[PDB]
Design a protein around this ligand. Structure first.
Ligand code: HEM
Ligand code: HEM
Ligand code: HEM
Ligand code: HEM
Ligand SMILES: [Fe+2]
Ligand SMILES: [Fe+2]
Ligand SMILES: [Fe+2]
Ligand SMILES: [Fe+2]
Ligand SMILES: [Fe+2]
Ligand SMILES: [Fe+2]
Ligand SMILES: [Fe+2]
Ligand SMILES: [Fe+2]
Ligand SMILES: [Fe+2]
Ligand SMILES: [Fe+2]
Ligand SMILES: [Fe+2]
Ligand SMILES: [Fe+2]
Ligand SMILES: [Fe+2]
Ligand SMILES: [Fe+2]
Lengths: 156, 156, 156, 156, 156, 156, 156
């Protein structure tokens, strides 16, 4: 079915967000795993899979709407060198993605692409969960301190 | 069966206590859950259910004794902004409820409402358990310190 | 995540509706149970649980959006003294809640709070079911008469 | 296999009957369901499926006999506004269908289309069952009265 | 163990109440069964067993306290000739038994026979349940009318 | 609950679309089955059931909103005489239905009928799947040729 | 453990190959899926997972050897517009990756990084399998022709 061109660009832009998230989260995961922070590796790894599921949905949608998924361009990864910096970087990434999502959803509605919209709201709901998790973790670090926080990540 | 009027007022007053406890405990629970303090969310949530069971018992009793359960008036909730303050507030609530319970039990006995009395003693026994749990938690916070205490609530 | 302030007020107002519904439905339930109308006690009781689930969703959402859930203020309960009056009172309550819900949903959409919106539409769908059930019961009372209707509620 | 042309017209006419029955029964079903008359919704719904099975048999037969099933023309639905009127309308529909069936069966026999005939007799046997059920229900309404009859439909 | 003499007299008086209840309930049960009121036979029969359990408890207690259980004297049975009269008669019986129970419980407490007391409160709690059931049934008779009430007792 | 009149007309119009789809798909199915194209009979048959599920949803919704479902008027079926023509006709039908759906969804939103809207978006999502399937099949016919395509439909 | 710097660069380069393969294969997969070529979607999808497993191994290894995995730079994807072109593009990609792999393996051996070597030989063995599969598919296309080849991909 020929889709609205601007919806397709939005979908590709969103796809673009997912593919930075996929990599940044995956590297973070294995950084944590390396450091022995087993618990944070399990969670970030599973968020990486989450972003992959999202990318797949965009890809199938773009293809269905007869556009070209763009997996060629990769935005800026911001990796960071310690637990806090890296969680904080994932949070900024999620917050930017949510911003773009809110914009795309409004636009899909106004051209009547209600199923692209519905798919995007489901994704947003997931993003909002990722945001909840990062925010809580970052606060726990302050509340219990870094040393206690790290000890808490040792067993899955 | 027509009950003693003053027993009914006592039952309604006690019902009133349960309904503040229900709300205060439920909010506290989801405050803890939000903060990632998973363990305290499980316990307060289950105390919330406990207070609901109590309310139900009062309601069925009042109705049986042919009075009007009053779910309209809600006493003061005292929420508090951090773990200690909030546990401490639940403890004062429990202590006030126990006080009212002791009074009602004595009065039920003197008008021969032994089954209202028996029901109230069972509830009091539960309250006294809630009091035990709050007192222990509050002491643990001092003994192990706030940071260690918080780390201890992360996993259920 | 910091939410839109007006969405939070709406959420608290809706939460407020749920908490009157919870109490009014619960009392009605146990009034029916007392009268031996076993079937109406099962249904209203299960609607009470429904409204509790709703309240919980609002509470977690408000907390997530970083506002203060307000469980302190309780609107007017309208209890009523016989089956019809009481069903009819639940129906007016549901109709008012749906009205507020329609308003909040439109507003969430216009500030792009699509996940609050999505949650609210799911709740509205439940409310609309509660409305269907009340409307049908009230009509059955007229169609079959009050005596036959009551006999019909004796066994669950 | 090339069939007798007039058998095909009969088959299409009968198919036509089934397709009004399908719709009228389905709407009636969901009218009863809406009104809370759960028992009548189950039965009419299952008669709707029955008529669908019949239509399917006609369609496959027409196709086998190399004619064109006509699903384009739809006869008059007569819906009615209350339980009796609506049951009574289904009964007139069944009685008309049986009449057409008796005629087609006789004609199939005389051109030696014995398998069309055999299929039609099986269907007629079903119709005659639907007629039995409507007649009994209509009589029960008089014998027990409308109010008792309605109370009797509340549980499946 | 030698018990307080007056506690023993109370126990025998209460035993006396149970033995009228046993008979009156059993006859009522089989009267209902004869009349085809299957549901009321099941309930009254099970209340008969209940009163037997009570009598047994008194008998074992009296014997333990070294008194003589008196099964010789039987109070007045009041049977009645129709469903209402008979339910109403069971209710007056229960109300009289509860009165005697309240008196005995107070007295046991004041001579420190706390286990006799505890046993009596458990029994009272059962009586109060029997009272609830009779009161509800009697009200259902008025609310739904005698004919509908009787039809409602036909199947267990 | 009294619904918006124009939503009801839309619902009836959409219901109208479903009922042509139901018939056209069912006939197509049994045409394919007759021709031995077993695979296409399974799929179109299951799309027929899909459209039935849709019709049912409209019917229950209209009834709930207190309007009259219209199963009397049947739009134009366009049957076609060979596989391609017939698939292509189903595709035009789906495309027209999606158009009407997009319009109704926008309108439901603006009168705040969010649950009708939610139901319509779910249906649209299904339609969009039916469109995907038809488009793919039509392209496969060109890519692999008609003869290979037909051989491919012989086994389910 | 501090690794040899040049082994780390090789590992990152190889990682780089895997990440183009991951995307190109994933898009190809969903392109085939869209076109209904179900069989080719299953295989390319599973090759995508394969390349992901490879990337993960590089990432964990680089991290272990204390270097920085580079997921930021993405080489050229070459997508192509039809089945042959796209398979042929995957084959060129695999052939280039194998070339780099052969070079890295020889170099790891000469600095005594035998476990990086062992890991690389296992990966190479997988690549060589991917190459086998592409080569066979491309030949099947010529041997059986494009139309027969496409029909052959319709069912998984
Ligand atoms: C105020 C008077 C209330 C009464 C009398 C009441 C009564 C009850 C009862 C009897 C239960 C079942 C307990 C059991 O058998 O395990 C229950 C469950 C529950 N209640 Fe309430 N309730 C009240 C208010 C609330 C409130 C304000 C909330 C907060 C949202 C709430 C949340 C819940 C939840 C989440 C469940 C369990 C549902 C599940 O299975 O997931 N209740 N309630
Ligand atoms: C036009 C209004 C119709 C409505 C609202 C309707 C509704 C339904 C529904 C709800 C089902 C059950 C779906 C499920 O749970 O699997 C069903 C089944 C079915 N329908 Fe229809 N239907 C309609 C017309 C037709 C027509 C014209 C035919 C053609 C003969 C047909 C053929 C069938 C068949 C063969 C089944 C499966 C029954 C079985 O299990 O054997 N329907 N229908
Ligand atoms: C005088 C008229 C009475 C009648 C017609 C009667 C009838 C019955 C019947 C039919 C059973 C059930 C038998 C079975 O199926 O196993 C039963 C059980 C029993 N009866 Fe009686 N009974 C009478 C008096 C009493 C008395 C005075 C006592 C002394 C306390 C007594 C004690 C019991 C006990 C302990 C059971 C067993 C219940 C259980 O399963 O726990 N009954 N009775
Ligand atoms: C960038 C585009 C990518 C897409 C669209 C994608 C897609 C997927 C999907 C759909 C799954 C299976 C999830 C399910 O069960 O449904 C998966 C699994 C997986 N992915 Fe990705 N992926 C991508 C990139 C990556 C990257 C860069 C890595 C890093 C090495 C990676 C690592 C993994 C791993 C380790 C698994 C699971 C393997 C297992 O342990 O069973 N993926 N991917
Ligand atoms: Fe995402
Ligand atoms: Fe995310
Ligand atoms: Fe309590
Ligand atoms: Fe308590
Ligand atoms: Fe609600
Ligand atoms: Fe509600
Ligand atoms: Fe039929
Ligand atoms: Fe029929
Ligand atoms: Fe007793
Ligand atoms: Fe008793
Ligand atoms: Fe449809
Ligand atoms: Fe469709
Ligand atoms: Fe690879
Ligand atoms: Fe490879």
């Amino acid at each position: 079915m020929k889709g609205d061109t601007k919806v397709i660009n939005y979908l590709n832009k969103l796809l673009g967000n997912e593919l930075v998230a996929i990599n940044q989260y995956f590297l973070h995961a294995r950084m944590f795993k390396n450091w022995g922070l087993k618990r944070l590796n399990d969670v970030e790894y599973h968020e990486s899979i989450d972003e992959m599921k999202h990318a797949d949905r965009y890809i199938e949608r773009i293809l269905f709407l007869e556009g070209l998924p763009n997996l060629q361009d990769l935005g800026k990864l911001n990796i960071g060198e310690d637990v806090e910096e890296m969680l904080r970087s994932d949070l900024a990434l999620e917050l930017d993605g949510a911003k773009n999502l809110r914009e795309a959803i409004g636009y899909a509605d106004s051209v009547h692409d209600y199923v692209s919209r519905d798919m995007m709201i489901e994704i947003l709901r997931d993003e909002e969960g990722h945001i909840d998790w990062l925010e809580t973790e970052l606060d726990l670090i302050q509340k219990m301190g870094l040393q206690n926080y790290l000890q808490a990540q040792i067993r899955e």
